[PDB]
Amino acid sequence: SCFLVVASHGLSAIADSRIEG
Amino acid sequence: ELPRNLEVFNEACGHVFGSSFNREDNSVISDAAAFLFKMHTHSLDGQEAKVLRASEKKRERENAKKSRKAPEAGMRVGRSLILTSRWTEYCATCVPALGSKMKVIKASGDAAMIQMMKDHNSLLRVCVRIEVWKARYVSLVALDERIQTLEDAQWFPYLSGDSYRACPGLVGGYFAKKAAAGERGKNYKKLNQTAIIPPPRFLIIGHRLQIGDQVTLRELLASIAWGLCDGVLAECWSPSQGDGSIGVVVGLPLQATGSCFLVVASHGLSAIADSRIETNLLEECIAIQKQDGVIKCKRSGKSLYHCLKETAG
Amino acid sequence: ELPRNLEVFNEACGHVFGSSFNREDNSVISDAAAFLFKMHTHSLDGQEAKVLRASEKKRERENAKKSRKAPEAGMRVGRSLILTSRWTEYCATCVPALGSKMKVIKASGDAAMIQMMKDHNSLLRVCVRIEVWKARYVSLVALDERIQTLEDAQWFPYLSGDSYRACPGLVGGYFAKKAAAGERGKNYKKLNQTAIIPPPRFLIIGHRLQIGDQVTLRELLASIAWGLCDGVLAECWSPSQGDGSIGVVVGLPLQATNLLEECIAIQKQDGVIKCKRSGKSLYHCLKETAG
DNA sequence: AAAAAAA
DNA sequence: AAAAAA
């Protein structure tokens, strides 16, 4: 699967939602 | 009652699909729009071959298409769309000949042909908008194998060249990439990847998407975002009494387009490539405008597709 | 007792727009300046064709422009500007012939022709200055599609080649980029994105921007900066009693963890003060403070 | 989140 | 400020 979160509505992009921390 | 664009689309789909065209189903409208876009771009069998500057390998496919028999009446399109016996007449009368250009038609001075070309252009725009919305809708529950990194996701949706020509500001893909890479003129339009597109059942009626509309979660999300957008956007929805399937819209995101976070160096200051970064990302918020007022909602930090997958488990 | 620079512009605007030209509205003055600039650059309908080295498409465009009907008296240019019957005479007598070069005018020795060419050049400079101010004003609330990174933002304003040829030190864009990416010399002028251009309503009368003159926040911000400049510059403006969208200038910036502690120098009525930067561009600040 | 260009 | 001059 893909865990990307593109930047939208002023939010910053995330290369991996799991690695976030 | 309706603008020229929506009236033209309604007339075309009615003429081509008889009573089989359901006006309240998004899937049926998307299929009809796709078929009409193919018809008006001469992508169906039996239409003019695109040979102007085509390479031999492309001329092979174009000649194969031209030689192939055109669709027959009663053919099944998509799931629940059936071609009428009078679709050939509509194709012959309402589709401009291959290579037609507005300048040549204007030079001719025929008002009827000018109106026909205007209707063709408006129909192409409407069909491409419906195509983009359907691409978002499909991406909500089906990852695109092509998109593996943020750079790939930057150019969603990956639609054909005709789509980009019709709606350069809503269509991404190879041609949006090419336009961005190349020289940028005054006419250059950037890819608004999260522009608000009403559902096809609303778009053909002319009803702008707003607060209070009785819509499903998936179709609202396809309207305001796509699969890889942040999950917090789901806050723009609220299930109705008894749950069921259809809920209501409680708000719409702000800054859907035109978000720039640059600060150029001036008066002895230093440039900033991104004000936000300049630092926990999960603390970010989105301004959802509701009926009462704008509220800042903390980002979920998770994709919309994965949120939908988890809530469906 | 205004300078010839402003007198020429005022006379041209009068001759071309009659009483419809309001000298107290920035938008009207910007529209008039744009029309005069496109008239003096031979860009209106029915004017000569730029076919010295035009390519096929450009040749066709110029020939169509020549063939097209020229503007006529009463035409609406913008929102509050109406052409007068004298505009044809002004275009015939004051606009130099296409391709005219000052070398040949000086060689001929005609004093009247030299004066006409000098007035044409001065008018072009004034019109381009007003164009740059209006570009800043527009960018305060709507950024150009070409500006996505700092490299792209370095060349604001993205104006035409004639604009750059008239004001190389103020105009940016493709031709400024080309000049930077080419040879440099004494004649080379560096783009100053924050050079102080007074508002057109002040510029056309020679009034220099100074502390204590009534202005609007957007007016001052466009006069001293543009949209992507740091928001701290908004401290150069202060609303009046009841605001009403009209305030007063309180300072003019100089030089026209630690990164966000950088300060700008503001010259106030007393002396130079250091004001900490805001960290957000004026465009973003205006968007967030709109409500 | 109007119209005119137009692999 | 004068000069130059896709």
Residue numbers in the entry:
A (entry chain E): 292 to 312
B (entry chain D): 34 to 311, 316 to 350
C (entry chain C): 34 to 289, 316 to 350
Sentences from the paper on this structure:
This comprises a head and body domain between which is a positively charged groove, where single-stranded RNA binds.
Model building of the nearly full-length TiLV-NP (lacking the first 33 residues) and associated RNA (deposited with generic purine or pyrimidine bases) was performed de novo in COOT using the map corresponding to two RNA-bound NPs extracted from the TiLV-NP pseudo-C5 pentamer, at 2.9 Å resolution. Importantly, both the quality of the RNA density in the 2.9 Å resolution focused map of covering two adjacent NPs from the pseudo-C5 oligomer and the A-from double-stranded RNA helix in the pseudo-C2 oligomer unambiguously reveal the 5′ to 3′ RNA directionality of the RNA bound to TiLV-NP. As mentioned, in the 2.9 Å resolution structure derived from the focused map of two NPs from the pseudo-C5 oligomer, a total of 12 nucleotides are modelled within one NP. The phosphate group of U8 interacts with K134, and its base is stabilised by N154. Finally, U12 phosphate group is surrounded by positively charged residues (R94, K90), while its base stacks with A11.
